[PDB]
Amino acid sequence: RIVACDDPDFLTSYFAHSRLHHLSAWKANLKDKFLNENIHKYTKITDKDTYIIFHIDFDCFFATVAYLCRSSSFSACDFKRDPIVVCHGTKNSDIASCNYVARSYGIKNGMWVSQAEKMLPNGIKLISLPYTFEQFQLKSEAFYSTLKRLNIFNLILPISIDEAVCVRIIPDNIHNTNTLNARLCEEIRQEIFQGTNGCTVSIGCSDSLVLARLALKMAKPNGYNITFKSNLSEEFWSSFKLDDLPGVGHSTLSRLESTFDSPHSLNDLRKRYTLDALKASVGSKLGMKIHLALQGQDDEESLKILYDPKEVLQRKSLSIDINWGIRFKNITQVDLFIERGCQYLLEKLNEINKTTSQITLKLMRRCKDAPIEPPKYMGMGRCDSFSRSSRLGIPTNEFGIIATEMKSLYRTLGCPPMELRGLALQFNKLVDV
DNA sequence: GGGGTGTGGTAG
DNA sequence: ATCGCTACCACACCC
Ligand SMILES: Nc1ccn([C@H]2C[C@H](O)[C@@H](COP(=O)(O)OP(=O)(O)OP(=O)(O)O)O2)c(=O)n1
Ligand SMILES: [Mg+2]
Ligand SMILES: [Mg+2]
Ligand SMILES: [Mg+2]
Ligand SMILES: [Mg+2]
């Protein structure tokens, strides 16, 4: 009952099961809906406007919906009492989402099931629910629909399936801003709960993107938080990890922890940092971004989504990226897979009425000293990453040009088929009509 | 120099 | 078993 990477159904089957593919496709479709819904409606925000940002996202999105939509086989479980996760497997399988009970024992999104099992004391069973992908989309739709129907935002910007940044242009210096915006946060939460038949959202509310994002994290689960620039305090800053800053992930955290000696919070970092030391640790741009965030201000790059959302949400590239289940014996099977991949991308390119004038092939090769079979079944394991790009000349949607060039790019990279653990095929420059 | 390329990082 | 995607920005480098 298993579809391999050299089977013609592989892509279809992989993409049917892959939650990360679904996240990307859903995001791509929401940006498209935004562009189509706002064809005529030119609503833009200028640097002279005063505005409030409501950053809204679902609490434990997949866990909540998978529980409400669960099959008869899982009737007995209780979302308030039981530790519940959404995953495919039983061992080295990613927890896509876990409920707040599971989180009280230390279980976290992205953790393998087997690792999560060990954090439960004896007597307590981990409940594993399947993915309900179509129902995830239906709940998102009800969410976004509720946001519009309220008719209170000048701009509704999709971030993800379960998350949106909503903007209200307002006068400078209004009376009772904290209390009036608390009322809205409460109205929004109740309306979404009713509109989704029982999913909860949290809301971060501020006068900048960065603070509204931090306020949302502080609000979780099932609450709201309002912190304007003028409400900033050491106690607010003391509540956040460094990688709570947008643009700071695993790798930037490590560099910031090294340079500033493992600050426990953003408030510890506020006290220790200089702008010049930040730039040295993490780069000029990101160093500046962080310095600005610690004053509750957005960088110019982040603000582009408010100042010109149609430009920012315009799709500029298209690709597929498959780094799971890649086990080829020879170059013939690789070529067939690339061809299937190019055709899939061409069908999408043709759906959206564009051509491409530049492509890239990117692969993942088993590291010299890594094991032939990694600990995750069909995982890529430790790998080195290599890429080559190619200009096609005239924009085109011709399979013969595109696929021949992709296969050639694979040849230029020189990875033996059996060392291949991952492939991405990319159309880097898109042209309309 | 702007302007290219491959590499690496981030977010749901 | 298990489904580790993908768009985008930044940078080092280069010649
Ligand atoms: N690494 C990830 C991140 C996210 N998701 C999916 C499942 C999540 O439910 C959904 C939204 O991600 P969030 O990061 O908003 O996480 P949750 O909604 O699960 O939890 P929280 O309550 O912290 O927002 O995206 C995933 O499968 N794998
Ligand atoms: Mg979230
Ligand atoms: Mg969420
Ligand atoms: Mg989210
Ligand atoms: Mg972060």
PDB file of N, CA, C and O (backbone and C1' of nucleotides) and ligand atoms in Angstrom, chain A residues 57-61 162-163 220, chain B residues 12, ligand 3:
ATOM      1  N   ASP A  57      -4.895  35.062  15.426  1.00  0.00           N
ATOM      2  CA  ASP A  57      -4.674  33.688  14.991  1.00  0.00           C
ATOM      3  C   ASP A  57      -5.379  32.674  15.873  1.00  0.00           C
ATOM      4  O   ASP A  57      -5.674  32.918  17.037  1.00  0.00           O
ATOM      5  N   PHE A  58      -5.646  31.525  15.279  1.00  0.00           N
ATOM      6  CA  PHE A  58      -6.320  30.446  15.978  1.00  0.00           C
ATOM      7  C   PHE A  58      -5.401  29.834  17.003  1.00  0.00           C
ATOM      8  O   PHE A  58      -4.179  29.625  16.744  1.00  0.00           O
ATOM      9  N   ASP A  59      -5.995  29.489  18.140  1.00  0.00           N
ATOM     10  CA  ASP A  59      -5.308  28.661  19.126  1.00  0.00           C
ATOM     11  C   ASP A  59      -5.299  27.197  18.671  1.00  0.00           C
ATOM     12  O   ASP A  59      -6.319  26.678  18.228  1.00  0.00           O
ATOM     13  N   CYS A  60      -4.147  26.565  18.848  1.00  0.00           N
ATOM     14  CA  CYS A  60      -3.815  25.237  18.403  1.00  0.00           C
ATOM     15  C   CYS A  60      -4.662  24.750  17.239  1.00  0.00           C
ATOM     16  O   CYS A  60      -5.519  23.858  17.372  1.00  0.00           O
ATOM     17  N   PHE A  61      -4.408  25.351  16.082  1.00  0.00           N
ATOM     18  CA  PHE A  61      -5.375  25.304  14.987  1.00  0.00           C
ATOM     19  C   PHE A  61      -5.707  23.855  14.586  1.00  0.00           C
ATOM     20  O   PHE A  61      -6.858  23.449  14.741  1.00  0.00           O
ATOM     21  N   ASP A 162      -4.499  30.214   9.280  1.00  0.00           N
ATOM     22  CA  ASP A 162      -5.125  30.448  10.587  1.00  0.00           C
ATOM     23  C   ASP A 162      -4.786  31.831  11.185  1.00  0.00           C
ATOM     24  O   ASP A 162      -4.932  32.012  12.392  1.00  0.00           O
ATOM     25  N   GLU A 163      -4.316  32.773  10.360  1.00  0.00           N
ATOM     26  CA  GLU A 163      -3.702  33.969  10.895  1.00  0.00           C
ATOM     27  C   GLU A 163      -3.782  35.134   9.945  1.00  0.00           C
ATOM     28  O   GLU A 163      -3.468  34.999   8.746  1.00  0.00           O
ATOM     29  N   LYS A 220      -2.010  34.360  24.196  1.00  0.00           N
ATOM     30  CA  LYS A 220      -2.381  32.935  24.057  1.00  0.00           C
ATOM     31  C   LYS A 220      -2.459  32.159  25.397  1.00  0.00           C
ATOM     32  O   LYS A 220      -1.672  32.434  26.276  1.00  0.00           O
TER      33      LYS A 220
ATOM     34  P    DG B  12       5.290  32.197  12.727  1.00  0.00           P
ATOM     35  O5'  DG B  12       4.121  31.352  11.991  1.00  0.00           O
ATOM     36  C5'  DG B  12       2.982  32.032  11.471  1.00  0.00           C
ATOM     37  C4'  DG B  12       2.223  31.207  10.435  1.00  0.00           C
ATOM     38  C3'  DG B  12       1.449  30.037  11.046  1.00  0.00           C
ATOM     39  C1'  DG B  12       2.928  29.251   9.341  1.00  0.00           C
TER      40       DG B  12
HETATM   41 MG    MG D   3      -2.333  29.426  15.537  1.00  0.00          MG
END
